[PDB]
């Protein structure tokens, strides 16, 4: 019997893995990409004005 | 902030610039609407009534012959019409009755002249509660 | 009552509104400004493509 | 590990652990006076 | 015949509620009243007039229904 | 043993896999198994800064945090078929609420004593039903306690065991002649679509809880 | 039968998730927070 | 004799919902009072006794179906 | 025999969703509350009063209601 | 006694839809929420406190009629 | 005694429509949420969760009924 | 015994219009979407897909309605 | 057994009125497709498709009702 | 097994009031119709077919309500 | 077997509000028509002739009720 739900959660586990895990891929990288980009930003500026 | 800027304008004289004001009522076409220190930013076609301006002050209060109210979104509501009123003196119903029967006869011409004189019924009509 | 649809614009129905109200004017104020407000003295011509005319009609 | 920070739960929080212990409590009223069902 | 006055009891209890089509439909009269005179301050010796005309030949309709009730509880 | 304790035990090594195993080596980038915790911590954050609006009000941020996360992981645990009701048991949760109501009440009173009492006069009213509105807000005030963990977990009675019936009716589906194969997948998809109501029922009500004793901490610590 | 059995686990679980968090698991992140705008604002 | 005590019973049971025109009717009065007195503040006074006015004999029409009930019981 | 105290709580089950009314009604009276005081933020003041006002007076019915069942259940 | 047990238990049964308007009222409470801070955006933590006071009241009508259901069935 | 069980399955048929609340109730929400983003698209994150909040409140209503209906089943 | 079912089957009759709140439901959502279009021209890419989200758990809750009227029919 | 095919009938009756909210509803859709589409005579037949589809997968419940109303004939 | 066709009929009878939904909406889809066209009378019966579409297989549901009546009744 | 004429005549009872929101609905075009034409005066010769041709084919099916329950009584 409960067979039938495992079954509805491995299609719903392909269903994730096809649709739901790219869309966080994108969004963790975009977040990390943005992070990455300020937290270097901030210290390349102040390299500047150490250069000033 | 507390309060309100009010900004009422006339193509002749604007009476208030920037005046801080408590409270604000004059006729949209959704009915006589009041407006209070904030306010949702609301574009109101003026239809001709009376607007009456309360303050810290008294609420004076004006035959207005219609225009815009307009509620910037910083809570700062301006009005845009043409005509401003006294108490009461500018309003005389001898001067009303005897042209406003006048103006119905004018509402049975032809079409621009009818509809032109069908206005002014309805504005001597509407200065009728101005009369009180 | 249906003037945008039969009758004036509604800058022209305020100033219809307008002479009316100072058309019932108190006659103690109503004032040389009140009367230069109503003073329509204007005249159009509508020209036509090939430059030409109508007769001038006092608006 | 992690860091330990010496954060304040005591001298916060102790209310909902005093109605944990009086819940408790009634809990051991009701479960001697409802268990013989 | 020992049931048909149990049968009148519920009857008159299931005849009952039909004042509920009274309890809403009065008060959204009330309820356009004032939008009738928050709108419009003039229009009111208009309208308190009609609007309570308006009241009465609705609800008596209601009325109705709950004096069946007692002609059902008796007749 | 009780396998609910050894639920609890797997509610606290899960706890413990979501930060330690999940922090590479503590490094500034934040990377993207910690972006779990870093967005439930602003979206916690920022829930309850607005919510009690106190110049004091980080002070009850981690027992909200820790009255979500629990409720947020217990409804992750029993979505897995194969399990046993985690947060379906109405006498633990409700026993929960009980223990947060009641601690409310005495947090109010420590801080108000007798003007904690001021919370049943709300706002202006004329005389001859000034003390109705308190009736029914201490009617309200026990109904403020019990309806909040009767809420989620009977949501649970009512989750897991629907996933119980309708596969039963999808097991009395396909015992019946053959031809109970052809298009006998709809109810697989709307099992699938209960399961993805499921989560909501998980998820959101976690965040219901959350925000509603956010409003009920709000209420207690300040007099309106 | 088992009300005591599920509410003193589950009270010391709460405990436990309450001493935890606030010890380590909430500020562990907040040094993240802190050493983020100590880099930026340098 | 020994039925109708119980139809009795469910005949106070059956009418009295009728405090549903009570507990929708009047309300949705408040309702357009709000409205009424929130896009037009100066018209408060002007209002609330004409609403509430419209209160009362909108709601003793609920009050009716309850003490029918009580005739029902009693 | 048994059905007259029987027929008394199926007459309290149906006796009582009266407050359904109540379920509608003083709900609105917060809605027309926030589509009144969404339109002018500054009426809040004036209006929170009369509010709780229309609220009170058009639940008690509905509190009437399971009372009403409460002495028909009891 | 066969019967009394039966009838409690249709009578918790027909004590179920006192939450229906209920159903539909904290929900409509909510879309005055969605017609407020959508036409006024600076005005989502002013109204937010007393709409989530107006939710709870608004469970205070169709929640008794529940337990009206639990009672019942004890 | 052959009829208490029957008697609690028509006691869980007559327990199963005050769903009916949720129906309507979570619809004029996203009805509202639609109002909501349609006259003011750049304030949608503010109303997106804060929509389907009330979702959760309406529908686990809605989902008290029919498990009243359930343990009325069992 | 010779009862149980029947009451069973008049039990899913009455379990039945419960899924009135479907009919309804989900409608009056697509009332407010073919608003939402109507009085904002390019809201439609942002609209629908969340009005679907609007669409489907709200429909599923009247699929509860018939799913009892499934199970009491049969089970 | 002489009962239960009657009984078959009358529940085959009360599942029957459920297309009450059915035609309720794609009323409410062709009311709001009239005034969308008069305020909006540009964009007629872009909308006009998910209305009919709204329409559509709307009256569909009251299809399942129906034919739920035939087979508890059978 | 007398009991099975005066059944039959008073099935037919509660497979009446299912049409309550349609003798509501088709009427309000032409109301739609007046507030459009009373706005803009410059697009009467483009939209007509929209309207006699939604009466037509909105009545339909009324239609199959008393032709779920007849077929149960006779 | 008594039972038969009784039933028919129960069943001409359950018969009856199908007209109900008929009452409502035929009603409320009036009023929609009370607000296109207090609206719009140059549109009434346009939308009182249809509008009543919205009343009648609505209604009608309201009658549809009262006729089944004629053929029902008889």
Same mark, same amino acid.
């Given at each position: 019997?409960?067979?039938?739900?495992?079954?509805?959660?491995?299609?719903?586990?392909?269903?994730?893995?096809?649709?739901?895990?790219?869309?966080?891929?994108?969004?963790?990288?975009?977040?990390?990409?943005? @992070?990455?980009?300020?937290?270097?930003?901030?210290?390349?500026?102040? @390299?500047?004005?150490?250069?000033? | 902030?507390?309060?309100?800027?009010?900004?009422?304008?006339?193509?002749?004289?604007?009476?208030? +610039?920037?005046?801080?004001?408590?409270?604000?009522?004059?006729?949209?076409?959704?009915?006589?609407?009041?407006?209070?220190?904030?306010?949702?930013?609301?574009?109101?076609?003026?239809?001709?009534?009376?607007?009456?301006?309360?303050?810290?002050?008294?609420?004076?209060?004006?035959?207005?012959?219609?225009?815009?109210?307009?509620?910037?979104?910083?809570?700062?509501?301006?009005?845009?019409?043409?005509?401003?009123?006294?108490?009461? +003196?500018?309003?005389?119903?001898?001067?009303?009755?005897?042209?406003?029967?006048?103006?119905?006869?004018? +509402?049975? +011409?032809?079409?621009?002249?009818?509809?032109?004189?069908?206005?002014?019924?309805?504005?001597?009509?509407?200065?009728?509660?101005?009369?009180? | 009552?249906?003037?945008?649809?039969?009758?004036?614009?509604?800058?022209?129905?305020?100033?219809?509104?307008?002479?009316?109200?100072?058309?019932?004017?108190?006659?103690?104020?109503?004032?040389?400004?009140?009367?230069?407000?109503?003073?329509?003295?204007?005249?159009?011509?509508?020209?036509?493509?090939?430059?030409?005319?109508?007769?001038?009609?006092?608006? | 590990?992690?860091?330990?920070?010496?954060?304040?739960?005591?001298?916060?929080?102790?209310?909902?652990?005093?109605?944990?212990?009086?819940?408790?409590?009634?809990?051991?009223?009701?479960?001697?006076?409802?268990?013989?069902? | 015949?020992?049931?048909?006055?149990?049968?009148?009891?519920?009857?008159?209890?299931?005849?009952?509620?039909?004042?509920?089509?009274?309890?809403?439909?009065?008060?959204?009269?009330?309820?356009?009243?004032?939008?009738?005179?928050?709108?419009?301050?003039?229009?009111?010796?208009?309208?308190?007039?009609?609007?309570?005309?308006? !009241?009465?030949?609705?609800?008596?309709?209601?009325? !109705?229904?709950?004096?069946?009730? !007692?002609?059902?509880?008796?007749? | 043993?009780?396998?609910?304790?050894? $639920?609890?035990?797997?509610?606290?090594?899960?706890?413990?896999?979501?930060?330690?195993?999940?922090?590479?080596?503590?490094?500034?980038?934040?990377?993207?198994?910690?972006?779990?915790?870093?967005?439930?911590?602003?979206?916690?954050?920022?829930?309850?800064?607005?919510?009690?609006? &106190?110049?004091?009000?980080?002070? $009850?941020?981690?027992?909200?945090?820790?009255?979500?996360?629990?409720?947020?992981?217990?409804?992750?645990?029993?979505?897995?078929?194969?399990?046993?009701?985690?947060?379906? /048991?109405?006498?633990?949760?409700?026993?929960?609420?009980?223990?947060?109501?009641?601690?409310?009440?005495?947090?109010?009173?420590?801080?108000? &004593?007798?003007?904690?009492?001021?919370?049943?006069?709300?706002?202006?009213?004329?005389?001859?039903?000034?003390?109705?509105?308190?009736?029914?807000?201490?009617?309200? $005030?026990?109904?403020?306690?019990?309806?909040?963990?009767?809420?989620?977990?009977?949501?649970?009675?009512? &989750?897991?065991?629907?996933?119980?019936?309708?596969?039963?009716?999808?097991?009395?589906?396909?015992?019946?002649?053959?031809?109970?194969?052809?298009?006998?997948?709809?109810?697989?998809?709307?099992?699938?679509?209960?399961?993805?109501?499921?989560?909501?029922?998980?998820?959101?009500?976690?965040?219901?809880?959350?925000?509603?004793?956010?409003? $009920?901490?709000?209420?207690?610590?300040?007099? /309106? | 039968?088992?009300?005591?059995?599920?509410?003193?686990?589950?009270?010391?679980?709460?405990?436990?998730?309450?001493?935890?968090?606030?010890?380590?698991?909430?500020?562990?992140?907040?040094?993240?927070?802190?050493?983020?705008?100590?880099?930026?604002?340098?």
């Amino acid at each position: 019997d409960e067979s039938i739900l495992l079954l509805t959660f491995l299609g719903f586990t392909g269903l994730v893995a096809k649709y739901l895990a790219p869309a966080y891929k994108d969004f963790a990288d975009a977040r990390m990409k943005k @992070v990455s980009d300020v937290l270097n930003a901030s210290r390349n500026k102040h @390299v500047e004005a150490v250069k000033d | 902030s507390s309060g309100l800027k009010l900004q009422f304008a006339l193509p002749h004289e604007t009476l208030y +610039s920037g005046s801080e004001v408590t409270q604000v009522n004059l006729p949209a076409k959704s009915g006589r609407i009041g407006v209070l220190a904030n306010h949702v930013p609301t574009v109101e076609q003026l239809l001709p009534g009376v607007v009456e301006v309360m303050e810290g002050s008294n609420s004076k209060k004006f035959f207005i012959s219609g225009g815009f109210a307009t509620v910037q979104p910083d809570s700062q509501l301006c009005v845009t019409a043409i005509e401003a009123f006294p108490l009461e +003196s500018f309003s005389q119903e001898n001067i009303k009755n005897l042209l406003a029967e006048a103006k119905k006869n004018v +509402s049975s +011409s032809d079409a621009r002249e009818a509809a032109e004189a069908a206005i002014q019924v309805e504005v001597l009509e509407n200065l009728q509660s101005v009369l009180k | 009552s249906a003037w945008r649809k039969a009758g004036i614009s509604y800058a022209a129905y305020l100033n219809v509104a307008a002479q009316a109200i100072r058309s019932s004017l108190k006659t103690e104020l109503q004032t040389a400004s009140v009367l230069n407000r109503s003073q329509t003295d204007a005249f159009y011509t509508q020209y036509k493509n090939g430059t030409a005319a109508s007769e001038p009609t006092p608006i | 590990m992690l860091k330990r920070f010496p954060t304040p739960i005591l001298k916060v929080y102790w209310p909902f652990f005093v109605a944990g212990a009086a819940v408790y409590y009634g809990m051991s009223k009701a479960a001697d006076l409802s268990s013989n069902t | 015949m020992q049931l048909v006055l149990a049968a009148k009891y519920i009857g008159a209890g299931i005849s009952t509620i039909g004042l509920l089509g009274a309890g809403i439909g009065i008060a959204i009269v009330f309820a356009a009243l004032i939008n009738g005179v928050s709108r419009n301050p003039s229009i009111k010796d208009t309208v308190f007039p009609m609007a309570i005309l308006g !009241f009465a030949l609705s609800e008596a309709t209601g009325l !109705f229904c709950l004096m069946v009730s !007692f002609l059902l509880l008796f007749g | 043993l009780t396998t609910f304790s050894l $639920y609890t035990i797997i509610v606290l090594l899960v706890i413990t896999s979501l930060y330690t195993l999940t922090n590479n080596n503590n490094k500034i980038i934040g990377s993207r198994w910690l972006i779990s915790q870093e967005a439930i911590y602003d979206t916690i954050m920022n829930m309850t800064k607005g919510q009690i609006g &106190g110049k004091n009000w980080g002070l $009850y941020f981690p027992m909200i945090f820790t009255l979500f996360m629990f409720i947020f992981i217990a409804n992750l645990i029993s979505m897995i078929p194969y399990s046993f009701a985690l947060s379906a /048991h109405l006498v633990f949760i409700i026993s929960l609420s009980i223990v947060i109501w009641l601690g409310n009440t005495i947090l109010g009173l420590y801080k108000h &004593g007798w003007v904690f009492f001021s919370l049943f006069v709300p706002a202006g009213t004329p005389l001859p039903l000034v003390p109705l509105l308190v009736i029914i807000e201490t009617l309200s $005030y026990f109904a403020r306690a019990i309806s909040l963990g009767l809420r989620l977990g009977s949501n649970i009675l009512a &989750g897991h065991l629907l996933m119980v019936i309708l596969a039963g009716l999808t097991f009395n589906f396909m015992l019946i002649n053959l031809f109970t194969l052809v298009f006998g997948f709809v109810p697989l998809a709307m099992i699938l679509a209960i399961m993805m109501l499921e989560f909501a029922i998980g998820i959101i009500q976690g965040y219901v809880w959350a925000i509603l004793t956010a409003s $009920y901490l709000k209420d207690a610590v300040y007099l /309106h | 039968f088992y009300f005591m059995n599920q509410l003193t686990y589950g009270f010391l679980l709460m405990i436990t998730l309450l001493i935890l968090f606030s010890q380590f698991f909430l500020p562990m992140i907040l040094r993240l927070y802190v050493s983020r705008l100590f880099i930026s604002k340098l």
